[PDB]
Structure 1
């Protein structure tokens, strides 16, 4: 019965997937990013898979407005999250004891700070 599990493919792996009804059964009463993107995806899929020109063009018109609204929502999200990240970074480095006890050997060049070759550098003349 190995073929029944290897060579037999699930119906969902071949047939086109349907619409997840539970995603739309109950929705919040807020015209928020989730609802806006759900509507955008619905209209986009309908445009992709539909032969009706009259409904697609109006769907395109509505989808442009949906894109603008989603851009506004994303701008708000970006502002809030970026400000929070910057403030958290600043507070972390304000309250974090930065290690100031690293090795300083690199900054020292004993042979260069005090020229080891002395006067022999200038010409030689021996």
Structure 2
């Protein structure tokens, strides 16, 4: 019976998957990033798998328009997220008790601070 679970392969693993229709049934009444990405991916898959030409070229033009719109949406997302990240970084370092209590031994080299070989580097003995 082991073969029935090892040799046999799930149908979905072999055949091309269809649409996840649940993601196209209830859509928000917005031109938001999610709907724009869904439309972009639909048109891209169509032009990747369809043998027709006029519809494919219409979808190419609409895909360029969607690329511009999605670039605008990504610009807004990037601006908001990065500004929030920088502000949170600054506020964290304002409210963080920065530890100014680390060992300073690295800044001290007495043998070099007071030259141990006093004048002995300036000519030998005899």
Question: TM range, normalised to the smaller chain?
Answer: over 0.9
Shift of 1:125: 3.0
Shift of 1:123: 1.2
Query: In structure 1, how many angstroms separate the alpha carbons of the residues matched to 2:61 and 2:106?
Result: 64
SS of the aligned residue for 1:106 comes to: helix
* 2:121 matched residue in structure 1: 121
TM-score (norm 1): 0.99
Shift of 1:5: 0.4
CA displacement 1:37-82 (0-9 Å, x = unmatched): 0000000000000000010001000000000000000000000000
CA displacement 1:74-109 (0-9 Å, x = unmatched): 000000000000000000001111000000001000
SS of the aligned residue for 2:106 comes to: coil
Query: In structure 1, how many angstroms separate the alpha carbons of the residues matched to 2:98 and 2:57?
Result: 59
Query: In structure 2, how many angstroms separate the alpha carbons of the residues matched to 1:123 and 1:15?
Result: 87
SS of the aligned residue for 1:9 comes to: coil
Q: Note the residue ranges of structure 1 that are not aligned, 5 or more in a row.
A: none
TM-score (norm 2): 0.99
Query: In structure 1, how many angstroms separate the alpha carbons of the residues matched to 2:54 and 2:65?
Result: 18
Shift of 1:9: 0.3
Q: Note the residue ranges of structure 2 that are not aligned, 5 or more in a row.
A: none
Runs of at least 4 residues of structure 1 off by over 3 A?
none
Query: In structure 1, how many angstroms separate the alpha carbons of the residues matched to 2:6 and 2:109?
Result: 69
SS of the aligned residue for 1:118 comes to: coil
Query: In structure 2, how many angstroms separate the alpha carbons of the residues matched to 1:116 and 1:124?
Result: 15
